[PDB]
Ligand binder design. Structure first.
Ligand SMILES: CC(C)NC[C@@H](O)COc1ccc(C(=O)NCCc2ccc(S(N)(=O)=O)cc2)cc1
Ligand SMILES: [Zn+2]
Length: 257
């Protein structure tokens, strides 16, 4: 199956998922001098006060915290979006060393990791139908750099030892994703895709300008996860990022001057 290794990594994905060479693939490099300020872009609306986390799970390509999305309890609206998008899950991509790990880049700069908060457009009823629409998902992307610790991440990192291998999950209730957001909600936006198979071209990307800082100890715990399942040859879950893809006929818009 697909992965991030030598013989199944991102350069191979197009054989099973030909849209990998498509016209609106993600991630991309954000050239800050080429992105144009759009004064018509509204402030983002992050409404997470009633978010209900359910589970945390190692899925073989990342770890994910899942939320109750059967009601409008944690929604994203405004910004470049038309309508209400419900939070389904968040997950991260990270590197083997601090100078790589993000999927999006900024003037070719790679960050140590990237957080993706995944939401789907309520006008399509369920996430599976949303992934078949060009405006079906909205992913909020947040860069992580290594420095001071992010206190609101510690509850996540402390439970990772209980989901070390592919397939494992645990109860993860009462987690507040507001503790992972930076001060500013200034952002770049462009039309793109899922960054893992099936690479569906269904995402409005909203990438925050301001990174969050996490400690070397916190990211070290990400790097102790395993791609493999319990009992198979241990392969550390590191470098689970797709590189930047061709921008093609797309403009990146900025919400800020
Ligand atoms: C009904 C049967 C046939 N299955 C059809 C379909 O409903 C399957 O159910 C699904 C389908 C898709 C999802 C889903 O969440 N897909 C998106 C996965 C996904 C989300 C976010 C990213 S990233 N790295 O860009 O932020 C990448 C992949 C969840 C459930
Ligand atoms: Zn992702």
């Amino acid at each position: 199956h697909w992965g991030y290794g030598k013989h199944n990594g991102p350069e191979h994905w197009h054989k099973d998922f030909p849209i990998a060479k498509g016209e609106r693939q993600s991630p991309v490099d954000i050239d800050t001098h080429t992105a144009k300020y759009d004064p018509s872009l509204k402030p983002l609306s992050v409404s997470y006060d009633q978010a209900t986390s359910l589970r945390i799970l190692n899925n073989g390509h990342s770890f994910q915290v899942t939320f109750d999305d059967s009601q409008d309890k944690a929604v994203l609206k405004g910004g470049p979006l038309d309508g209400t998008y419900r939070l389904l899950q968040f997950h991260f991509h990270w590197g083997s060393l601090d100078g790589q790990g993000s999927e999006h880049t900024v003037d070719k700069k790679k960050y140590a990791a990237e957080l993706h908060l995944v939401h789907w457009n309520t006008k399509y009823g369920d996430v599976g139908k949303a992934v078949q629409q060009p405006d079906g998902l909205a992913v909020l992307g947040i860069f992580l750099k290594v420095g001071s610790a992010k206190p609101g991440l510690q509850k996540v990192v402390d439970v990772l030892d209980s989901i070390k291998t592919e397939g494992k999950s645990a109860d993860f209730t009462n987690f507040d994703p507001r503790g992972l957001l930076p001060e500013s909600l200034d952002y770049w936006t462009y039309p793109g895709s899922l960054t893992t198979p099936p690479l569906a071209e269904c995402v409005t990307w909203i990438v925050l300008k301001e990174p969050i800082s996490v400690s070397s100890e916190q990211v070290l715990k990400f790097r102790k996860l395993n791609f493999n399942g319990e009992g198979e040859p241990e392969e550390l879950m590191v470098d689970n990022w797709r590189p930047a893809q061709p921008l093609k006929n797309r403009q990146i818009k900025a919400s800020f001057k």
